[PDB]
Amino acid sequence: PSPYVEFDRRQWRALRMSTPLALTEEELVGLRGLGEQIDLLEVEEVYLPLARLIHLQVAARQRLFAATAEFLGEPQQNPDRPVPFIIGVAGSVAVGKSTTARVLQALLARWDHHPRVDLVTTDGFLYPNAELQRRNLMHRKGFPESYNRRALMRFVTSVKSGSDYACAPVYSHLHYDIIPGAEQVVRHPDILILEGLNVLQTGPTLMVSDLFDFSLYVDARIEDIEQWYVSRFLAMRTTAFADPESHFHHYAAFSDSQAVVAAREIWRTINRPNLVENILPTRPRATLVLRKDADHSINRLRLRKL
Amino acid sequence: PSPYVEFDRRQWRALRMSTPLALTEEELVGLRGLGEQIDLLEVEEVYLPLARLIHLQVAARQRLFAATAEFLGEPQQNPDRPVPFIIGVAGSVAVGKSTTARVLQALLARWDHHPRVDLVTTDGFLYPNAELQRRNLMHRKGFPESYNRRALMRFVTSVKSGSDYACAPVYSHLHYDIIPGAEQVVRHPDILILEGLNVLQTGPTLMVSDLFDFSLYVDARIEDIEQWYVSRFLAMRTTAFADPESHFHHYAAFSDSQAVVAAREIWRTINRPNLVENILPTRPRATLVLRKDADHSINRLRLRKL
């Protein structure tokens, strides 16, 4: 007896899921439009129903806003609109958060109830590298204290307050640092998806997850994430590591054997301990847990019972 | 710009609230049965409308359950019924949590959508005095670690899972200890109200508030709670202190002037510090913050924006 409705992938496919409603030409185009070999049979068979489920929560919240506003006789201090519905997305580095978040963004946007869907990563709230050196935290990049938690919280509070303007900084996955002066502006979207390692973490007072209406945790076996983490590092030889500007340049040259060793070391010393200590404990706090197989595909969904 | 809608009592009074909700007399008689010398003005102008706000949220959550169930084609994995809607109620010792909760319980029960409204206090989750001594924690009774947190979490998790049978222990307010072998049985109510000092307290991992659907914080100036505390202390001389085997009997025979001094001192060393350190910081985590005047009447309501 547990707080989850659990489905494996078979069962979830085996449906009897009221109206189907398919993806268009068109919508499938735009979804490879970000398609790092993004599996479209997975988008259609897992992510789309999952997006409908969430849509039911967004729609219910919009109708609550209205039943509540009507009851109070719409006073001058109640907002005219629902404030943004915020969805958190948590999980290890290299688990596919970003893809999950990007797919959901694209799918949720197709409803008339909420076509304006934003996506912000908390990576942009990490302290800049120089700032991090100054605090003796470089070896702790991506641990909770590596983020400007106060700015992170002010941002989400601003969005949840029905502000019309809220700005976050930006983090380069090329330079592995904050890009000075770059900014992402959010403008009272109907939905904000907030993606990051730390979004479901707790603190002593009001924490950002207090401002979430729904959250996901992307899960997998820790040996599988290590493998995806390694592959991603290797593939970086061709891309980000290829620039001589990079602090990781000397890595371009490494053979598959030596790049592995260098990767398995950052995993072991930084990302794995971060996962075990700080990220995985936040997993039972999510509304929905998606567990991925070694081959990247979803094999299990746990949804909090309603 | 802030995450809640604010009404002072004058603004709450300019109150074009849609439904003239029908209060019998009858029900008002029951309502006197919990005399914190309860003001029936208060019930009529404040608690009733609030209970309607809360009702909206239970109703929305109930219908969301059904739309979601129908969307999944009501599979075997899904429960047949919504799980209990859980309301947390926080605030200092002596602030009026218990009364507030007893009143919402009576008001909420009168909708047919949700007639079975349970009330549990987390006081039953304090370690028995015996255990507290064994831990060197007696002078910390009411502080976070004085509770069996694990057991509390297991209790709320069981209720949120849709268990038929969940049990809390009971804490005597006459013997100021856990009552051995005594248990309160909760049987899948439509609404559980969970009341206590620590309900909106934060933990490293899954906290009880993660399982709340709504939460209330009863607030007042720190001086005003002292006064209520002292009076409640004076009033126990005849009742709970009359007990000869009570570890407080030696207070029964205290004159007024002398009992004020003992009370103001115990306030200063256990309950006031607990409020500052552990209870007051949890305040902005509540969905609703009610602030009471010295007269026990609401002068400020703060509701999370929807």
Ligand SMILES: C[C@H](NC(=O)c1ccccc1C(F)(F)F)c1nnc(SCc2ccc(F)cc2)n1C
């Ligand atoms: C400590 C550092 N972490 C980050 O930059 C970071 C911090 C917070 C959130 C996300 C990230 C990361 F950019 F994906 F790595 C890091 N961890 N591994 C690396 S090597 C490049 C790399 C990044 C991500 C990955 F999945 C594989 C390799 N780096 C530079």
Ligand SMILES: C[C@H](NC(=O)c1ccccc1C(F)(F)F)c1nnc(SCc2ccc(F)cc2)n1C
């Ligand atoms: C440390 C002790 N606290 C409790 O028993 C307690 C612990 C957790 C939750 C609630 C309570 C209390 F029973 F309400 F005090 C306490 N603090 N003041 C007292 S004196 C009795 C008393 C209780 C409450 C009150 F408002 C006035 C007097 N006592 C026995």
